[PDB]
Write an enzyme that holds these catalytic residues in place. Structure first.
Site, PDB file in Angstrom:
ATOM      1  N   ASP A  47       2.216  24.406 -20.509  1.00  0.00           N
ATOM      2  CA  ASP A  47       1.580  24.026 -19.255  1.00  0.00           C
ATOM      3  C   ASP A  47       1.334  22.519 -19.157  1.00  0.00           C
ATOM      4  O   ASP A  47       0.525  22.059 -18.352  1.00  0.00           O
ATOM      5  CB  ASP A  47       0.304  24.853 -19.027  1.00  0.00           C
ATOM      6  CG  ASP A  47       0.604  26.312 -18.668  1.00  0.00           C
ATOM      7  OD1 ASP A  47       1.796  26.650 -18.436  1.00  0.00           O
ATOM      8  OD2 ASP A  47      -0.350  27.119 -18.606  1.00  0.00           O
ATOM      9  N   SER A  89      -1.230  36.095 -16.988  1.00  0.00           N
ATOM     10  CA  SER A  89      -0.913  35.089 -15.976  1.00  0.00           C
ATOM     11  C   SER A  89      -0.442  33.814 -16.632  1.00  0.00           C
ATOM     12  O   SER A  89      -0.910  33.460 -17.705  1.00  0.00           O
ATOM     13  CB  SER A  89      -2.154  34.783 -15.135  1.00  0.00           C
ATOM     14  OG  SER A  89      -2.670  35.969 -14.571  1.00  0.00           O
ATOM     15  N   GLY A  90       0.483  33.120 -15.981  1.00  0.00           N
ATOM     16  CA  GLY A  90       0.900  31.787 -16.410  1.00  0.00           C
ATOM     17  C   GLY A  90       0.509  30.807 -15.313  1.00  0.00           C
ATOM     18  O   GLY A  90      -0.190  31.185 -14.346  1.00  0.00           O
ATOM     19  N   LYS A 115       8.464  34.214 -17.372  1.00  0.00           N
ATOM     20  CA  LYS A 115       7.517  33.921 -16.283  1.00  0.00           C
ATOM     21  C   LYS A 115       8.222  33.998 -14.932  1.00  0.00           C
ATOM     22  O   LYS A 115       9.261  33.358 -14.747  1.00  0.00           O
ATOM     23  CB  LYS A 115       6.877  32.540 -16.448  1.00  0.00           C
ATOM     24  CG  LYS A 115       5.919  32.207 -15.314  1.00  0.00           C
ATOM     25  CD  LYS A 115       4.921  31.104 -15.625  1.00  0.00           C
ATOM     26  CE  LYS A 115       5.548  29.751 -15.745  1.00  0.00           C
ATOM     27  NZ  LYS A 115       4.568  28.606 -15.469  1.00  0.00           N
ATOM     28  N   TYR A 160       0.985  29.348 -12.092  1.00  0.00           N
ATOM     29  CA  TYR A 160       1.705  29.634 -10.848  1.00  0.00           C
ATOM     30  C   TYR A 160       2.633  30.835 -10.950  1.00  0.00           C
ATOM     31  O   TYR A 160       3.630  30.913 -10.228  1.00  0.00           O
ATOM     32  CB  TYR A 160       2.537  28.423 -10.405  1.00  0.00           C
ATOM     33  CG  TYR A 160       1.866  27.094 -10.580  1.00  0.00           C
ATOM     34  CD1 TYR A 160       2.511  26.054 -11.263  1.00  0.00           C
ATOM     35  CD2 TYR A 160       0.591  26.857 -10.054  1.00  0.00           C
ATOM     36  CE1 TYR A 160       1.902  24.808 -11.418  1.00  0.00           C
ATOM     37  CE2 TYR A 160      -0.029  25.620 -10.209  1.00  0.00           C
ATOM     38  CZ  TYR A 160       0.631  24.602 -10.900  1.00  0.00           C
ATOM     39  OH  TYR A 160       0.042  23.364 -11.049  1.00  0.00           O
ATOM     40  N   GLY A 161       2.301  31.785 -11.821  1.00  0.00           N
ATOM     41  CA  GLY A 161       3.111  32.986 -11.934  1.00  0.00           C
ATOM     42  C   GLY A 161       2.591  33.971 -12.951  1.00  0.00           C
ATOM     43  O   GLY A 161       1.521  33.782 -13.513  1.00  0.00           O
ATOM     44  N   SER A 162       3.378  35.019 -13.175  1.00  0.00           N
ATOM     45  CA  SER A 162       3.054  36.111 -14.092  1.00  0.00           C
ATOM     46  C   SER A 162       4.053  36.136 -15.231  1.00  0.00           C
ATOM     47  O   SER A 162       5.214  35.800 -15.031  1.00  0.00           O
ATOM     48  CB  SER A 162       3.151  37.450 -13.377  1.00  0.00           C
ATOM     49  OG  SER A 162       1.957  37.733 -12.694  1.00  0.00           O
ATOM     50  N   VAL A 163       3.597  36.600 -16.395  1.00  0.00           N
ATOM     51  CA  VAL A 163       4.387  36.606 -17.626  1.00  0.00           C
ATOM     52  C   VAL A 163       4.526  38.015 -18.190  1.00  0.00           C
ATOM     53  O   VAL A 163       3.549  38.760 -18.298  1.00  0.00           O
ATOM     54  CB  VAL A 163       3.771  35.698 -18.722  1.00  0.00           C
ATOM     55  CG1 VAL A 163       4.739  35.558 -19.880  1.00  0.00           C
ATOM     56  CG2 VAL A 163       3.476  34.304 -18.172  1.00  0.00           C
ATOM     57  N   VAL A 204       2.083  40.485 -20.048  1.00  0.00           N
ATOM     58  CA  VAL A 204       1.188  39.878 -21.041  1.00  0.00           C
ATOM     59  C   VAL A 204       0.077  39.029 -20.417  1.00  0.00           C
ATOM     60  O   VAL A 204      -0.853  38.624 -21.117  1.00  0.00           O
ATOM     61  CB  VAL A 204       1.951  39.057 -22.114  1.00  0.00           C
ATOM     62  CG1 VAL A 204       2.846  39.966 -22.946  1.00  0.00           C
ATOM     63  CG2 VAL A 204       2.740  37.966 -21.497  1.00  0.00           C
TER      64      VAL A 204
HETATM   65  O1  LIG Z   1      -3.992  33.921 -20.956  1.00  0.00           O
HETATM   66  C1  LIG Z   1      -3.097  34.561 -21.501  1.00  0.00           C
HETATM   67  C2  LIG Z   1      -3.241  36.019 -21.858  1.00  0.00           C
HETATM   68  O2  LIG Z   1      -4.589  36.394 -21.581  1.00  0.00           O
HETATM   69  N1  LIG Z   1      -1.861  34.045 -21.858  1.00  0.00           N
HETATM   70  C3  LIG Z   1      -1.751  32.709 -22.406  1.00  0.00           C
HETATM   71  C4  LIG Z   1      -0.655  31.911 -21.703  1.00  0.00           C
HETATM   72  C5  LIG Z   1       0.658  32.669 -21.663  1.00  0.00           C
HETATM   73  C6  LIG Z   1       1.795  31.977 -20.982  1.00  0.00           C
HETATM   74  N2  LIG Z   1       1.613  31.252 -19.871  1.00  0.00           N
HETATM   75  N3  LIG Z   1       2.840  30.819 -19.530  1.00  0.00           N
HETATM   76  C7  LIG Z   1       3.821  31.220 -20.393  1.00  0.00           C
HETATM   77  C8  LIG Z   1       5.192  30.831 -20.192  1.00  0.00           C
HETATM   78  C9  LIG Z   1       6.204  31.762 -20.278  1.00  0.00           C
HETATM   79  C10 LIG Z   1       7.522  31.392 -20.136  1.00  0.00           C
HETATM   80  C11 LIG Z   1       7.857  30.074 -19.902  1.00  0.00           C
HETATM   81 CL1  LIG Z   1       9.514  29.598 -19.773  1.00  0.00          CL
HETATM   82  C12 LIG Z   1       6.849  29.145 -19.794  1.00  0.00           C
HETATM   83  C13 LIG Z   1       5.525  29.518 -19.934  1.00  0.00           C
HETATM   84  C14 LIG Z   1       3.163  31.985 -21.357  1.00  0.00           C
HETATM   85  C15 LIG Z   1       3.742  32.586 -22.545  1.00  0.00           C
HETATM   86  C16 LIG Z   1       3.288  33.789 -23.058  1.00  0.00           C
HETATM   87  C17 LIG Z   1       3.885  34.202 -24.225  1.00  0.00           C
HETATM   88  N4  LIG Z   1       4.836  33.517 -24.877  1.00  0.00           N
HETATM   89  C18 LIG Z   1       5.189  32.362 -24.300  1.00  0.00           C
HETATM   90  N5  LIG Z   1       4.685  31.856 -23.163  1.00  0.00           N
HETATM   91  C19 LIG Z   1       0.468  34.043 -21.045  1.00  0.00           C
HETATM   92  C20 LIG Z   1      -0.654  34.831 -21.712  1.00  0.00           C
END
Ligand SMILES: O=C(CO)N1CCC(c2n[nH]c(-c3ccc(Cl)cc3)c2-c2ccncn2)CC1
Ligand SMILES: Fc1ccc(-c2c[nH]nc2-c2ccnc(F)c2)cc1
Length: 336
Positions: A163, A27-28, A48, A30-33, A25
């Site tokens: 974040d 980038s998060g 993530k 410091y990682g990928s989601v 879906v």
């Molecule tokens: O910029 C984009 C897409 O273009 N995004 C916005 C930020 C988005 C995103 N960034 N980080 C997390 C995340 C995931 C798991 C944990 Cl435990 C903590 C943080 C998400 C996310 C995505 C979906 N549902 C929940 N969290 C990823 C996608």
């Protein structure tokens, strides 16, 4: 449990079999989601994968920080931890961290972008940000980089902050941070909410600065150059030479700038976008503002348990930060 391995966008993912149908879906921090289906709970989740969690002391401490933050946050409007895992069977083999939360479908950058919100939607979205911030701030945590892209929103307008605490993004930043003041307070986040709310109502970035200098210029154009009470609080000779060298600017009439908006929204805006951060409304006070009359309930706007940030002052070896993180993974208790 039993793990299984796959490649998604150059990145390898080793996750337990309970998480199926992984789909990138974005980038998060410091990682990928990846989006996934949790076969155990029946929930759609976001996983993530931290990239190089233990690459250096800075990464190791940052990994520990994020895990500690996510384990602490239990609030409807703040991202929390459903699971955390590693394919490693021991500390010595521990080199990857995966963090799991509820899948959120979009963010506010996606939403505002070419879509005009009604005042009713803005009340609800900003109410939820403030309700989450009340909680975060009560734990003595500052977001520091609140912006539309880290406000996650579902199709039913439920909103969560992500974040937080990790610490252009410039556009939403408090002017005292643009000035490089190291003693800023939690109300830096309120400034950001004001910028966000303004944008939700008008459909345009309130302060789209092209750099740090331009950003402050744009801000002072709306809110005025500092008064005498605020100037006396600026220790920096250089900061004062810069600010006092600019042509004085009056505070504008918000009712005129945001004319057509709900007068209550205009009033809240002027209380959030106050130059002197000592005079800015707090998240708790903002929740009690008449703008949110239809949403506000002080018995349903909880505060957080105390959160120990004493590790932030500590200078530890990578192996120490890594072991601390490993113990935090092992001690994790999922929610009910
Ligand atoms: O910029 C984009 C897409 O273009 N995004 C916005 C930020 C988005 C995103 N960034 N980080 C997390 C995340 C995931 C798991 C944990 Cl435990 C903590 C943080 C998400 C996310 C995505 C979906 N549902 C929940 N969290 C990823 C996608
Ligand atoms: F142009 C300006 C001047 C001051 C601020 C400001 C707002 N709140 N607090 C400050 C501040 C206090 C102490 N030292 C500082 F550097 C900044 C923001 C923009």
């Amino acid at each position: 449990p039993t793990f299984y391995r796959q490649e998604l966008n150059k990145t390898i993912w080793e996750v337990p079999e309970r998480y199926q149908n992984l789909s990138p879906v974005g980038s998060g921090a410091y990682g990928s989601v990846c989006a996934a289906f949790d076969t155990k709970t029946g929930l759609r989740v976001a996983v993530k994968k931290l990239s190089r969690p233990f690459q250096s002391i800075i990464h190791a401490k940052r990994t520990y920080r994020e895990l500690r933050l996510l384990k602490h946050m239990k609030h409807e409007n703040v991202i929390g931890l459903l699971d955390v895992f590693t394919p490693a069977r021991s500390l010595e083999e521990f080199n990857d961290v995966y963090l799991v939360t509820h899948l959120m479908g979009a963010d506010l950058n996606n939403i505002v972008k070419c879509q005009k919100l009604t005042d009713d939607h803005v009340q609800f979205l900003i109410y939820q940000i403030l309700r989450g911030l009340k909680y975060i701030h009560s734990a003595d945590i500052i977001h520091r980089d609140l912006k539309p892209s880290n406000l996650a929103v579902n199709e039913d307008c439920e909103l969560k902050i992500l974040d937080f605490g990790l610490a252009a993004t410039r556009w939403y930043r408090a002017p005292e941070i643009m000035l490089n003041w190291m003693h800023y307070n939690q109300t830096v986040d309120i400034w950001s909410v004001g910028c966000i709310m303004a944008e939700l109502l008008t459909g345009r970035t309130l302060f789209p600065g092209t750099d740090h200098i331009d950003q402050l210029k744009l801000i002072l154009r709306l809110v005025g150059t500092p008064g005498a009470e605020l100037l006396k609080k600026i220790s920096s000779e250089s900061a004062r030479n810069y600010i006092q060298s600019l042509t004085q600017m009056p505070k504008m009439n918000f009712a005129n700038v945001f004319i057509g908006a709900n007068p209550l929204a205009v009033d809240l805006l002027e209380k959030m976008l106050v130059l002197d951060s000592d005079k800015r409304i707090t998240a708790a006070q903002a929740l009690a503002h008449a703008y949110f009359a239809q949403y506000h309930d002080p018995d349903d706007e909880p505060v957080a348990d105390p959160y120990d940030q004493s590790f932030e002052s500590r200078d530890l070896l990578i192996d120490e930060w890594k072991s601390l993180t490993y113990d935090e993974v092992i001690s994790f208790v999922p929610p009910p």
